[PDB]
Amino acid sequence: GLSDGEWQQVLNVWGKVEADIAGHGQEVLIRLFTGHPETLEKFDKFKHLKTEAEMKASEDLKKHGTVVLTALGGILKKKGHHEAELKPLAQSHATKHKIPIKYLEFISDAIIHVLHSKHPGDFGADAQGAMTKALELFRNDIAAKYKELGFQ
Ligand code: HEM
What we know:
This protein is mainly α. Helix content is 73%, strand content 0%. It contains seven helices and no strands. Protoporphyrin IX containing FE binds at residues 39, 42-45, 67-68, 71-72, 89, 92-93, 97, 99, 103-104, 107.
């Protein structure tokens, strides 16, 4: 549950992402894959990537980063009223992709890391607080759908 002022912070931060969605999306996925190599194994189309240089050179990885952040941005712009947008993603990630909630924690922290890396000194403590709460809400509502489905 976020206040209006917290949502305003989230959507202000998101403007930084929308200025370069593919570059942010690329770095988020690279941070996930390099920090948690078991996550790469869930992607049949990226498992061939052995080095970070290959990851950086991959145009399909940048494309998928755009898909991921476009979906997340659409959810964030709903300011918590995201049941219709979140349900299909929860269902596909639990039932088709088999993504444990832990990996959603990993990608949430990766987003925070990338924001500080690309905007050092320009991602203030209030902005980090609000973005973290928004990603916690996203993860928590996914977790509720995972429990419904019995998925671990
Ligand atoms: C911010 C969190 C994330 C969002 C918004 C997101 C969004 C998406 C979207 C929009 C798709 C394509 C449509 C679909 O299949 O439902 C997708 C596919 C997928 N996602 Fe995610 N995802 C997230 C996190 C993750 C994580 C952490 C993993 C694994 C570690 C993952 C694994 C996958 C896989 C394996 C696919 C299919 C890729 C392919 O072969 O085309 N997702 N995701």
